[PDB]
Amino acid sequence: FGGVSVITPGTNTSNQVAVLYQDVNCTEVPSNVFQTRAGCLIGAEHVNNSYECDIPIGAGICASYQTSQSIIAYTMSLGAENSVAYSNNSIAIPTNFTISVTTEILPVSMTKTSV
Amino acid sequence: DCTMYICGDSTECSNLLLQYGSFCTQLNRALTGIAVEQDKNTQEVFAQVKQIYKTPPIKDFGGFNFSQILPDPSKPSKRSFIEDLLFNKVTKFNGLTVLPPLLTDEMIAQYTSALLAGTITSGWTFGAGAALQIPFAMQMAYRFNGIGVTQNVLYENQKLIANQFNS
Amino acid sequence: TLKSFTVEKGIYQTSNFRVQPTESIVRFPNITNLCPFGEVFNATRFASVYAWNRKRISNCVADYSVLYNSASFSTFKCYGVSPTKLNDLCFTNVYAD
Amino acid sequence: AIGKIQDSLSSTASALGKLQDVVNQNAQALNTLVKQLSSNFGAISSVLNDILSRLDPPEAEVQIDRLITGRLQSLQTYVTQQLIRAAEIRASANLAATKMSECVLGQSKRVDFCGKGYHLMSFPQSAPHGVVFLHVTYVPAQEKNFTTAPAICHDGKAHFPREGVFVSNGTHWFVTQRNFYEPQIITTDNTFVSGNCDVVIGIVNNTVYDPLQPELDSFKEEL
Amino acid sequence: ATKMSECVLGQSKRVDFCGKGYHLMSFPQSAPHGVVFLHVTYVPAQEK
Ligand SMILES: *[C@@H]1O[C@H](CO)[C@@H](O[C@@H]2O[C@H](CO)[C@@H](O)[C@H](O)[C@H]2NC(C)=O)[C@H](O)[C@H]1NC(C)=O
Ligand SMILES: *[C@@H]1O[C@H](CO)[C@@H](O[C@@H]2O[C@H](CO)[C@@H](O)[C@H](O)[C@H]2NC(C)=O)[C@H](O)[C@H]1NC(C)=O
Ligand SMILES: *[C@@H]1O[C@H](CO)[C@@H](O[C@@H]2O[C@H](CO)[C@@H](O)[C@H](O)[C@H]2NC(C)=O)[C@H](O)[C@H]1NC(C)=O
Ligand SMILES: *[C@@H]1O[C@H](CO)[C@@H](O[C@@H]2O[C@H](CO)[C@@H](O)[C@H](O)[C@H]2NC(C)=O)[C@H](O)[C@H]1NC(C)=O
Ligand SMILES: *[C@@H]1O[C@H](CO)[C@@H](O)[C@H](O)[C@H]1NC(C)=O
Ligand SMILES: *[C@@H]1O[C@H](CO)[C@@H](O)[C@H](O)[C@H]1NC(C)=O
Ligand SMILES: *[C@@H]1O[C@H](CO)[C@@H](O)[C@H](O)[C@H]1NC(C)=O
Ligand SMILES: *[C@@H]1O[C@H](CO)[C@@H](O)[C@H](O)[C@H]1NC(C)=O
Ligand SMILES: *[C@@H]1O[C@H](CO)[C@@H](O)[C@H](O)[C@H]1NC(C)=O
Ligand SMILES: *[C@@H]1O[C@H](CO)[C@@H](O)[C@H](O)[C@H]1NC(C)=O
Numbered sequence: 038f039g040g041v042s043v044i045t046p047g048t049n050t051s052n053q054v055a056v057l058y059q060d061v062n063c064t065e066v067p068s069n070v071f072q073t074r075a076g077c078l079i080g081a082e083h084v085n086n087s088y089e090c091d092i093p094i095g096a097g098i099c100a101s102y103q104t105s106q107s108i109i110a111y112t113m114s115l116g117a118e119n120s121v122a123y124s125n126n127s128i129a130i131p132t133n134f135t136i137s138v139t140t141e142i143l144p145v146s147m148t149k150t151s152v
Numbered sequence: 153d154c155t156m157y158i159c160g161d162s163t164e165c166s167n168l169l170l171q172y173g174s175f176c177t178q179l180n181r182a183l184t185g186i187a188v189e190q191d192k193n194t195q196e197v198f199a200q201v202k203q204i205y206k207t208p209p210i211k212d213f214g215g216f217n218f219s220q221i222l223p224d225p226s227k228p229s230k231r232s233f234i235e236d237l238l239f240n241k242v243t244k245f246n247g248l249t250v251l252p253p254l255l256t257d258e259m260i261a262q263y264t265s266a267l268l269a270g271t272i273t274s275g276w277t278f279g280a281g282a283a284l285q286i287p288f289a290m291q292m293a294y295r296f297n298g299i300g301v302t303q304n305v306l307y308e309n310q311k312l313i314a315n316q317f318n319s
Numbered sequence: 320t321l322k323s324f325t326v327e328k329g330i331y332q333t334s335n336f337r338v339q340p341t342e343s344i345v346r347f348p349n350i351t352n353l354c355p356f357g358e359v360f361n362a363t364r365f366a367s368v369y370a371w372n373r374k375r376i377s378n379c380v381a382d383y384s385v386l387y388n389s390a391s392f393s394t395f396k397c398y399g400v401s402p403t404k405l406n407d408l409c410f411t412n413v414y415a416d
Numbered sequence: 417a418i419g420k421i422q423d424s425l426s427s428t429a430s431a432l433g434k435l436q437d438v439v440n441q442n443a444q445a446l447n448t449l450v451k452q453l454s455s456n457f458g459a460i461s462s463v464l465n466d467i468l469s470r471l472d473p474p475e476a477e478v479q480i481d482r483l484i485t486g487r488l489q490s491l492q493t494y495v496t497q498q499l500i501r502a503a504e505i506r507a508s509a510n511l512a513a514t515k516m517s518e519c520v521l522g523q524s525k526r527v528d529f530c531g532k533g534y535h536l537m538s539f540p541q542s543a544p545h546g547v548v549f550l551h552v553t554y555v556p557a558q559e560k561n562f563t564t565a566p567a568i569c570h571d572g573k574a575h576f577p578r579e580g581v582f583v584s585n586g587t588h589w590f591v592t593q594r595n596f597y598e599p600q601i602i603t604t605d606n607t608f609v610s611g612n613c614d615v616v617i618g619i620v621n622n623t624v625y626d627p628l629q630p631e632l633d634s635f636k637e638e639l
Numbered sequence: 640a641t642k643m644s645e646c647v648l649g650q651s652k653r654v655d656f657c658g659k660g661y662h663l664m665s666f667p668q669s670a671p672h673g674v675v676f677l678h679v680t681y682v683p684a685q686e687k
């Protein structure tokens with residue numbers, strides 16, 4: 038036994054779904070069948086390429102609706118790899134700058150209900 | 153699972169419980185929200201860097217030794233010796249399941265490695281913006297100037313400070 | 320599950336998976352001894368109220384169908400176990416006072 | 417940047433999801449509390465007037481007791497969830513008040529407390545059951561590689577920068593501030609003297625310009 | 640997360656927010672369902 042999770046994009050975008058059978062092997066489930074540590078995933082194509090996570094699944098696997106378009110499964114990308122040119126006599130000092138404005142939104146209150 | 157817990161494999165029990173309406177659904181929803189927000193906490197605390205940095209193969213950090221905190225390439229999971237000691241120390245069928253975390257321990261190790269490499273090679277510049285490579289002696293001079301202590305102190309006692317840090 | 324005709328992008332837990340059983344396994348000891356309820360209920364003489372008899376009964380198979388079938392019993396009340404589902408249950412010991 | 421924030425707020429509806437989830441969660445709790453009145457809780461009906469209009473008190477008290485137990489359980493669960501959500505919201509509001517006091521009413525030197533980069537100042541904006549901050553931050557953009565040294569010998573003494581660090585473009589050495597490239601001639605006004613050249617690891621050879629010498633060149637003419 | 644952002648990604652001038660003494664810098668280490676910080680601090684030793 039195990040939980041049944043449905044992986045879908047927005048219904049206005051597509052009606053194609055991928056089904057995750059949580060904490061089970063891919064044997065008792067009655068193509069496009071993949072096996073993760075989060076359970077048995079059916080309907081999502083396994084892709085070697087890594088992307089940013091869109092719909093989380095578990096154990097580093099995330100699903101997305103990409104290209105013709107279909108639901109794909111892939112390992113999470115933790116970011117672009119960038120080695121630093123470290124040396125004992127090398128310094129990087131900026132010569133130009135930019136002024137950026139970022140939006141931070143925080144809740145304050147909720148509905149003052151009374152029953 | 154509420155129905156699996158209260159009424160396992162019983163149609164009659166499920167029909168009786170169905171008279172309680174959506175008591176069952178609310179409980180699952182709260183637990184699902186908890187399971188989401190724990191991954192949210194993990195991402196908030198660890199995914200604070202935009203890029204995965206790595207140290208150069210030459211560990212010329214002015215005498216400072218970081219081999220006990222840098223990851224070990226020989227291990228199956230690239231984790232430090234200090235990380236390994238910590239992992240060793242810290243140690244059913246009624247619908248009670250455990251969901252795996254979204255971020256695995258290897259990815260947590262990679263995030264800590266990226267943060268540690270960025271810190272060691274760049275000070276605070278990797279957190280402020282794009283990483284700026286700084287030799288570790290002048291980075292320690294920056295930190296010493298940050299506590300009201302003149303940098304002459306670090307350069308003239310660099311060996312003493314490196315030995316004390318290693319000890 | 321979402322009680323809506325439009326589902327937002329994401330992952331949702333909708334139902335649970337269960338492997339249904341294929342066949343039923345019924346296992347009982349293969350003893351075919353007739354049970355002595357007949358002498359208990361059809362004895363010529365019954366004991367006194369204070370000196371009520373007690374019969375220990377074991378190693379038999381009990382249909383109870385005659386107990387259901389006889390309408391001579393004016394009063395028939397079962398408390399701990401419902402009367403109809405008696406033959407489907409195997410018990411350790413039964414006493415007939 | 418202000419125009420970009422305006423365009424982003426006009427285009428992306430998921431920016432205010434942090435308030436939309438609070439409003440939606442309150443809606444879910446209210447809807448669940450309303451819909452829990454439809455449950456029989458083991459009684460003959462979920463309508464109190466139906467129970468009263470069909471049963472005399474000897475059975476009506478039992479059925480009404482079943483309804484009261486079910487509705488009390490629903491109310492207690494709703495109030496407990498409301499208390500937990502109110503505590504979380506209180507924590508968020510305390511964080512928002514701290515952010516205002518340390519970031520709008522002053523300048524915050526805490527890293528990433530007021531957005532990514534070197535924080536300068538922030539703007540408050542009103543929001544439905546919330547507050548929106550417009551953090552103005554300083555982010556370096558264009559970078560260059562330079563050859564550096566922790567100190568400089570002049571006459572056997574070790575010179576360290578009062579501000580900035582020593583950099584070289586390949587032929588000459590300069591001192592410039594940490595967060596912006598502004599090369600200046602290394603003078604005694606920019607540096608201070610401590611120790612000698614035999615203890616620092618990485619000192620290089622140069623000359624430190626002294627402001628008084630030129631007036632002294634006029635002096636040889638003066639003599 | 641606040642400790643990481645203000646103590647590993649930069650230098651904290653808050654007293655005892657990053658261990659006892661004058662804080663310099665910190666190291667993150669992974670832990671089972673947790674995080675471990677190695678705060679490097681400056682402590683005076685000998686006095687006159
Ligand atoms: C620093 O960067 C800014 C852009 O962020 C530069 O400003 C631009 O300069 C070019 C000339 O090459 C103009 O065509 C653009 O219109 C300018 N942009 C803006 C927004 O004004 C600036 O010149 C750079 N300064 C240095 C010293 O590199
Ligand atoms: C940093 O410290 C480690 C030990 O924590 C050093 O590794 C040791 O190196 C010696 C050789 O001198 C070996 O005999 C030991 O077996 C090593 N120990 C371990 C645990 O690897 C390392 O050499 C030091 N590096 C620097 C640059 O000082
Ligand atoms: C490093 O910077 C110095 C200072 O600007 C440069 O020296 C000048 O170079 C220009 C040529 O562009 C000459 O016209 C000046 O007379 C030089 N000044 C002095 C005091 O020598 C030097 O060329 C730069 N070197 C590099 C490799 O960029
Ligand atoms: C910086 O300049 C000094 C001279 O002012 C150099 O010192 C010389 O070192 C060599 C090697 O030990 C000696 O043979 C010379 O006699 C020293 N000069 C004097 C005047 O005593 C020093 O080596 C230079 N450093 C660098 C890195 O170039
Ligand atoms: C959903 O997709 C449709 C196109 O199929 C598009 O017209 C609509 O605007 C989309 N809605 C949103 C909000 O994404
Ligand atoms: C599923 O069963 C196979 C054996 O048929 C086993 O090798 C595999 O590890 C199992 N997978 C899981 C997730 O239990
Ligand atoms: C990934 O590439 C390997 C070859 O290196 C191949 O064997 C494997 O099937 C690929 N997996 C997917 C999902 O494409
Ligand atoms: C007692 O005898 C009658 C026949 O007169 C029979 O119908 C009944 O089943 C007997 N009772 C038992 C317990 O066998
Ligand atoms: C500095 O040199 C390194 C050499 O590996 C190079 O990768 C980097 O882009 C250089 N930085 C700049 C700003 O050109
Ligand atoms: C810097 O590293 C180089 C090797 O690339 C070495 O020759 C030199 O002595 C080092 N200088 C210092 C001050 O450590």
Ligand SMILES: *[C@@H]1O[C@H](CO)[C@@H](O)[C@H](O)[C@H]1NC(C)=O
Nearest residue numbers: 660681682683684685686687
């Ligand atoms: C300073 O003088 C006091 C006198 O009471 C003494 O107790 C203290 O130890 C002295 N400090 C040092 C560092 O000797």
